[PDB]
Every structure is written in structure tokens, then in C-alpha cells.
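Lab notebook, entry 500. We have the chain sequence and a SMILES string for tryptophan, and the next step in the workflow is to get a structural model of the bound complex before anyone spends time on docking refinements. Request logged below.

Task: model protein plus tryptophan, output C-alpha cells.
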Amino acid sequence: MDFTKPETVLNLQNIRDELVRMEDSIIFKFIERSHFATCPSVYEANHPGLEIPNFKGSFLDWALSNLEIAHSRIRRFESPDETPFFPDKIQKSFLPSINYPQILAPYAPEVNYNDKIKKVYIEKIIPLISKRDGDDKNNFGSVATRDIECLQSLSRRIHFGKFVAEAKFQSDIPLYTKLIKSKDVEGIMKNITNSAVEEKILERLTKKAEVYGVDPTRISPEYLVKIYKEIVIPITKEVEVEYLLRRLEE
Amino acid sequence: MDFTKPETVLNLQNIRDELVRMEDSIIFKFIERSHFATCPSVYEANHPGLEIPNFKGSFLDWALSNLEIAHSRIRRFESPDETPFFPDKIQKSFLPSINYPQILAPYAPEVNYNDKIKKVYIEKIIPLISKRDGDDKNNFGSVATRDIECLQSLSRRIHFGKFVAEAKFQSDIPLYTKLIKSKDVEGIMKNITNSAVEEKILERLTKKAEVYGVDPTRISPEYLVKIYKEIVIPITKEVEVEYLLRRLEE
Ligand SMILES: N[C@@H](Cc1c[nH]c2ccccc12)C(=O)O
Ligand SMILES: N[C@@H](Cc1c[nH]c2ccccc12)C(=O)O
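Result returned:
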């Protein structure tokens, strides 16, 4: 895919390849984060000892918002595949802007599920992948930086549902128009679900978990499957139906 | 290992485990960077189009130095296992400092091979792992951030030779004292080389390259072996002999 050549983007085979490559990215990052304890103090707002001068929020929030401000200055969020966790904080680039042709509907930047993602990550994913419960006082920064890597990968994968939805829309405008016009969510869901393909994904995930990071001479497959089945796939679909419901300007 | 409990640190079995875990980390990061072209413009100082207001250096340098300043404020370089690429730029922490007991010799922060590492990474490693030659104008930031991940992993692995050297020193002070006193480098090299173990490492690396990121239903083993054999292991040894030669205060 080349975000300056629209045809490489709305191409369904290029989309599968990118989704499959993100699958590995996400698995590698979960393995990196699994080496550390849960570190509850990292996600708690204004924790004594991890309190940042003139900042209201958690240790995780400071590290992530600061990273976004720096990257926004170098054009990160000008790209259609990048959605920010702190939309109010991002700056304008100090480098010549890349001219990205409009590929998605105009309101695309407004379809943003990062709050929900950050939330389920902390409340549901951390507890399954961490090595143990409790704070590891000497690894708060190691943890936060690994968390940022996991969040940015999940975010890109989940919001990639926008390109999936646009490809589908364009391939059958008459059908989608009627579904959108009558706001038939059940009809849309049924058209964006291929149960056969979803089983296949889960089966491949189980086999990757079995070999990845395992010394040939780290993460439970059951949990990897639970995460994709209960969190990743379902939220990707929410992004797709919301993108679609507003497709005829909204 | 717990950098607040010296015995967990100079323990040789805890050291193997940490080295083996970094082996996976490094392999995963090489795979992430392999998806992009060489991007020569990223490493060139003051490139037209990637020129940063009031900054002399490359795009890579700006991203990396800025990251270090932010992390230094949250105590990254207070930890003995973290060595900075920009020692002159790092700040003092605005959080209560962690009291790390002196585990390594005092001059330890001065043994820093990051310039050499950054250099061989650009000149020798990039060309072997990149997908193709040339600039990918729309992925300069994606590349730089992947480069930072690779550099920080290699840096931690290579400078980990300081702990290896201190463990050895402490286990046979009479022997090491004579080697150090007469500055016998050849004698030191011969005592820190177990050829049998080095073959074994290379063999395991070949088998990891064969399964990692390969869909069960990315990086050449030959190149992975060349990198560890010609760059990683040799520079780790340079860190160890330099740390040792200054051991009796220097
Ligand atoms: N492990 C140490 C040092 C550290 C490693 N990576 C970091 C990133 C940011 C801040 C600190 C760190 C800590 O968590 O404190
Ligand atoms: N791929 C785009 C956007 C991007 C992704 N990650 C980044 C990190 C920093 C800056 C930009 C980016 C680019 O390289 O420009």
C-alpha cells in the first residue's frame, strides 16, 4: 500500500497482507510486555511518587501524550492510518507537509476509538499478559514504553477498519446506500462478517503463539485467541459500522 | 535480576537468561525494520526536505536525542543497564530518584560505545535487513522510530558486557588482577572467550530466524548469524576488556 496511490490502498489483497503483518507486530509486543508485572501504579492518575510537576493524569498519560506531541511535529498524524490518543494536544508539523490525496470520507479523523482501546487494554489485556500482579518499582518506565508500543499497534489495527469499510462501500454502492439510508446496523454487520475467515484467523493465531519467542532448541494461545475474539475483531467492526453510517455526509 | 539486589545481578545464570531474552527482542525489532526500504535520507545530516528548524544533524538524530531528553526526566539513565546515545543532552529527573546501590565500578558510565554502534548499524546492518534500496518518502518517520527500537536493544545488549565482566572479576580477583596490572589484553580475551558456547549461540540464532515471523500455516538466517558474529559479540568483548583495564581505578 502507498497512501499516495489510492488503488494500492483500497485493494483487498493489500489490506489482508497489512492486517496479517500487524498480527505479528501485535504478538511480538505482547511478548515484550509479558516480561513485566502488572504495575497498577502506572495507570493511576496522580500517584504519590510518580507525580509529574504540573500534570494531572497517570504516568502512562504523560509518556504517551508527550510522545504524540513530538511525533505530530514530524507529520505522524498527517497520515490517514494514524489516529491519536490525545487529539487536543497534537501540533502542526514543522516540516513540509506530504500531500495525501483524500482516500477516506472527510470525517474519517473523527471516528476515533482510542479511549475505549486504552481502557480495555488496561482493564482487560494487562491482567492476561503480565507475568505477575503488583508494582515493580524499578520498572515503571520499561513498562510504560512497552505499553505505548502495544497501544499504537492495536490502535492502527483497529482503525484500519476504515479502509476495509471504504473498499467494501466502493465495490457495491447500491447495496450499501440502502443499508446506510435506513440505518440498518444488523444488515451492515451481516455484510461485514465472514465467519469462515474469522475461524481461520483464530486457528493461525493459536499456531503463532505456539512458536513465537519459544526457543527452538511466552504468551498463552488461549489468551491470544480470547483477546482477538473478544476485543480486536469486535471493536474493528464498531469502527466499520460507525464509518459507514456517516458515509453519506455526517 | 533486580538492580537493587546486587546478588541477583552478578549471578551468571541470571545473566544468561537476560542475554537470551534480548536475543528475541533484537530479532523481533529487525523483523519490524525489514518491512521498509533503506531510507538513506534519514541518516544524512541536514537533508533538504527533512531539515529541522535550528537543528544540525540528521532526522534520526533529532528523533533519538529528543526521546532521550524526555526519558531522562523520568529516570531512564539512572539505571545501570541504560547507556545514552547523547550523554551531553540528558537531563536530571523530576521524579524522586531510585537509589541504586553501586554494583559496577564508578567509571562505568564512561564506558560507552554508542557512537560505534550507531555507525555500524547505519553502514552495515541497515543494508542487510532492509527490504530494498532507496528512500520511501512516505515512511521516514516509521523507519526512524523502528531504528530507535533497534539501537536501544543493541545498545543494552552490547553494554551488558559490563555486568559480565564484573561477575568474572569478582569470581577470581587474583587472576584478573595480574592480567589488568600488566595490561595483558590477549590474556583477558582468552579468558572471556568460550568458543564452544559461541557456536551454540549461532546455531540457535539460525533456528530462531527460521521460525520467527514465519506464518506457521522475514530475516535471513545467514545475515542474522553474520550480524551477531561480526558485530554484536566482538563489540561486547571490546566493552568487557575496556571495563576491565580500568578496574583498579582509572
Ligand atoms: N527500567 C528503568 C529504566 C528505564 C528503562 N526504560 C525506560 C524508559 C523510560 C523511563 C525509564 C526507563 C525504569 O523503569 O525506571
Ligand atoms: N508513516 C508516516 C507516519 C508515521 C508513522 N509513524 C511515525 C512516527 C513519527 C513520525 C511519522 C510517523 C511517516 O513515516 O511519515
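Notes for the group: The pocket of tryptophan (ligand 2) is lined by residues A 71, 74-76, 79, 82; B 138-142, 145 (CB under 6 Å). Worth checking against the assay data. The domain at 1-250 of chain B is CATH 1.10.590.10 (Chorismate Mutase, subunit A).
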